[PDB]
Structures are given as structure tokens and as C-alpha cells.
Amino acid sequence: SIAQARKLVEQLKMEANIDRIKVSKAAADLMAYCEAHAKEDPLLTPVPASENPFR
Amino acid sequence: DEVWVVGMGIVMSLIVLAIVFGNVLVITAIAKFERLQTVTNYFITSLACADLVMGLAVVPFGAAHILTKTWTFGNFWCEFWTSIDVLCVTASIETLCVIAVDRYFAITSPFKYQSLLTKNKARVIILMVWIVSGLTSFLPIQMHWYRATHQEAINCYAEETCCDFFTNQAYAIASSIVSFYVPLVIMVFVYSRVFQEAKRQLQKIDKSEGRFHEHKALKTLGIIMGTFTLCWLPFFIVNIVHVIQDNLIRKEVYILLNWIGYVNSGFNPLIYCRSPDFRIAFQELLC
């Protein structure tokens, strides 16, 4: 009732006060993380048949 | 004369190609995909295999024999070819009878169909059909029980260049009864019962909800029965007619009706493989 609007209204505040960063830094961090482990994942680069346990 | 040879040859090659291609495609489609491997499709697989064997074995050699008008192989190969022809012809019909019986069981007994037919019993049924088909083809031909007794038959049998069919009354009757007449009444009765089922179901639906809203059954039953009957009926009549009394049926008519019987090979994929899933399978590969 009046109370339920009160809870949503109080919570909406908490979310508004959070600090944020620019999109460019977030994209750069994802690019760096993807570039760091490029050789790690076998899915991108097919593995030799010697080290493949499913063959 | 030369024109006849050129024309007859073109027809034989086209028939062979059409017979082989459809059966090979059906077998490949059934074997490749795991969604089409059911109990019903095993009978179709056996029928396709038998039809492919027949169309790959007995048609080219018969065409060579009628065109060259001289059998240039040994008597052993003549007997083997006759045995293979009889085996394939008598095994390409009992499979249709089994399919009809399976449809009868599926339609008239819906609650117990799952328990009645299992993958373990279909193999036994197919093996029994093949054994009973081969028991009447190689046994009385490799052994000389079908061999005739009159003078013309003996004269051709002594020679090593003529390979014709001469048989006694007992074999000519027993083989026909085993191959054609026995598997016909069963199909007729089964399809009559199926038609009655369909008619009563349609009548029930029309009575239930007609005010808001049997051509289909007959177009299907008519096609299925008529193709087989028109393909294989006259030959299995003249087979007994020309034996019950001599000098009634000429050799040319007999051979022509026998070759008309062979044409049934190219129609089985067109009749028993018209389901939409089969069309999708045919579109998936070689398309």
C-alpha cells in the first residue's frame, strides 16, 4: 500500500547513488582480459591430436 | 531390325538406373539418420534391399538374353540366374504382406501394439520370410525337381546355348501359390478391415462436430492395391494357364508379362516412402 511504495522508493535511491565509470575503460578491460588468455582456451585454436583426450 | 535393338536397349538401361537409384537412396536415407530407425522402417529396408538385389542381378542379364537371343554362359549360371530371379520375386511380396499385417495390428489394436511388436521380433519375422522365400527357389532348382520331362525341354536342357524356362505342373502350381495367391487374400481382408475402421471413425467425427465444419482413404488404398495387382496379376494367371494345357500361351506374351512384372521395382519407393520426414531426409543429402 502506501508502505510498499515506500520500500520501492527508498530502494530506488540506493541504486542511484552508486559511482560509475566511462564505457571506454570497461571495454578496454574486457579487451585486455580476452587478449591475455587467447592461447589458453582450446576452443578458439584447434588442438593437436596428441593432447586431445576425446579422440 | 537394327532400330528395334537400339530402342530396346535404351529402355532397359533407363529401367535399371531408375530401379537402382531409388532403392540406393532409400537405403542410404534409412541408414544415415537415427530418426528414421523404427520398427516399421525395417520391413521397408528389407523390401528395398530385395528389390535392389533383383534389379541389379536379373534385369541386365535378361536384357542381354533377349537382345542377343543367345545365352553365351554356362548352364550353371543359367540355373543360378533362374534361382536368384525366383528368390527375389517371391521375397518382394511377402514383405508387403507383412507391412499390411503390421498396419492392421497398429490400427485395430492401439493399446497393445507397443508390446506386440518389438525390435527383437521384427528381425525374427524378416529372417523367417527370407528363409521361406529361399527354401522354394534354390532347393527345387539346384536340385532338379522342377525339371520337365517332354522332348523340347530335354533338347534345350542338353544344349549349352539356350536358357529357357520349362517346368512341370506341380512346381508351377506350388510356387505360384506360395508367392502370390496366399499373400493376396490376407492383404485384401486386412485392408477391408482398415477401411471399415477409417469409415467408422470419420462417421463418428462427422456426427460429433459436423455442423460447424471418404475420398482420402480410397485414394490411398486404391493406389496401394491397384499398383501391385496390375503389376503382378496377369503373369501369375498365365503361369498356370500355359501349364494346365499346352499350346495356349505364346512365349512372347509370357516374356512380356514377366517383364511387366519387373517394372514394379521402381514404384515401391514412390508408394511406401512418401512421408514428409522422408522428404526432409532426401532434401538433407544429395540436394
Partner: protein, 239 residues
């Protein structure tokens, strides 16, 4: 050495697991599954009761195993768990026929809500090949309301004025024409929705049921047999 020993250990257990499944596959394939679903106050518990003399039930008719489900734990207008019930043999729908004037908090006639629920169920994407067995429960209260009743159906359903009794109707003996007209109007009110978008892949089997009745268990058996027979006939291109 050890590799032979481990394989003889592991392979043996698979064979055992395979054998148990074959024993279970037959009993799984033998049974037929049903779903019970109805509106509130319809009569569902009572229909299940005389049959006896999440909730699951075992009942066997003529050496055939049946299995019926009644879901009541989740009560919501939006139904998303329905995706799991696309392999059942049939759906049993129970609706209160006599509650054409109650109001459910203000809301449409209770029948109108049941009609909307049936329309939503029929046109669902995942239930395109599932038949429905329809039960019109509370057959005596409807007759009591129709005979010497102050309330009239024309007040709630305007279309009743231009509706005439079907020529093929076969009413039970002793019943007045008025109750027959009301009953058949209610029946075709569902039949229209059933027929509009059926597409020939699934049908409806309306029925009339009261409190003092003991033939529902045979009706379900006959309807399931008809459903399976029709499916098999359609599969081979014979219907």
C-alpha cells in the same frame, strides 16, 4: 594390470545399469499419462473421488495402466510450467457449468474466465498435438437454476436470444426443452473455440457429468482409445 582391473570393475557396473533400464523401459512404455486441470470450485476433487471407489494416481482399466496428475501447488494466472506436459496422451478439463452468474476482486462471469483459460490452453504453441477431454460438471444445479429460476442467462450472455436448439440433439428423457437449450448453448460455446483453430490435429470430447455418476472411468478409456486410433489413422494418411 591395473587398467585391466579397473575396466573389469567399470564395465561390469554398466551392464547392470543397462539391464535395469530394459526392465524399466517396458513398464515406462506401457503406461499412459494424463493431466487433470480445472478452474476453482469446479468439482475436480469429487470427480477424482468416485473414480477411486503435486498429486499422482494409479488406476487400471481392463489390464491397461493409466496415470493422472493434478497440479495445485502453483496457483498463478501465468502458466510457464506447461512446457513439460507436451507428451501426455490427453488433457482432462473440468468446468462448473452451473456457475454462469457468480462473480469471482470484481471479475467476469466465472464461465467467461474458464472460456478464456480454455482458449489460451488450446492455442498454446507447445500443445499443438494434444487432445482435450471436457467435463461439464454440476449438471443438477444448472437444471435447478433453469427451472423456476429468477436469474436468466440472457442477462449475462446476450447471444442467447438468436440461438436455437440443434436439430440433431438427443436429450435425455424427462427433461424440459429449456434445460436442453441451455446445456447445448453452453456446449457449443466451447465447441466453437475447439473447432475454430483445430487444424485437424487434435479434437475435443465434451461430456455431461453430475454428482451421482459412475461411468466417467469408462468414458476416459473410450476417449483415450479413440484419440490413439485417430492419431494412428492420420499418421498413415487414411483420415
Amino acid at each position: 594390470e591395473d587398467q585391466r582391473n579397473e575396466e573389469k570393475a567399470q564395465r561390469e557396473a554398466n551392464k547392470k545399469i543397462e539391464k535395469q533400464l530394459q526392465k524399466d523401459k517396458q513398464v515406462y512404455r506401457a503406461t499412459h499419462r494424463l493431466l487433470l486441470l480445472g478452474a476453482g470450485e469446479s468439482g475436480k476433487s469429487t470427480i477424482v473421488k468416485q473414480m477411486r471407489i503435486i498429486f499422482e494416481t494409479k488406476f487400471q482399466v481392463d489390464k491397461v495402466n493409466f496415470h493422472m496428475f493434478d497440479v495445485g501447488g502453483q496457483r498463478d494466472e501465468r502458466r510457464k510450467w506447461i512446457q513439460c506436459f507436451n507428451d501426455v496422451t490427453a488433457i482432462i478439463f473440468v468446468v462448473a457449468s452451473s456457475s454462469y452468474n457468480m462473480v469471482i476482486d470484481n471479475q467476469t462471469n466465472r464461465l467467461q474466465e474458464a472460456l478464456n483459460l480454455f482458449k489460451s490452453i488450446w492455442n498454446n504453441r507447445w500443445l499443438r498435438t494434444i487432445s482435450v477431454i471436457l467435463f461439464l460438471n454440476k449438471q443438477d444445479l444448472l437444471a435447478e437454476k433453469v427451472l423456476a429460476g429468477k436469474s436468466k442467462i440472457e442477462d449475462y450472455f446476450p447471444e442467447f436470444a438468436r440461438y436455437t436448439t440443434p436439430e440433431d440433439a438427443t436429450p435425455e428423457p424427462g427433461e424440459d426443452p429449456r434445460v436442453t437449450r441451455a446445456k447445448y448453448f453452453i456446449r457449443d460455446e466451447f465447441l466453437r473455440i475447439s473447432t475454430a483453430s483445430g487444424d485437424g490435429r487434435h479434437y475435443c470430447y465434451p461430456h455431461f457429468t453430475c454428482a451421482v455418476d459412475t461411468e466417467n472411468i469408462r468414458r476416459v478409456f473410450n476417449d483415450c482409445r479413440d484419440i490413439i486410433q485417430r492419431m494412428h489413422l492420420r499418421q498413415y494418411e487414411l483420415l
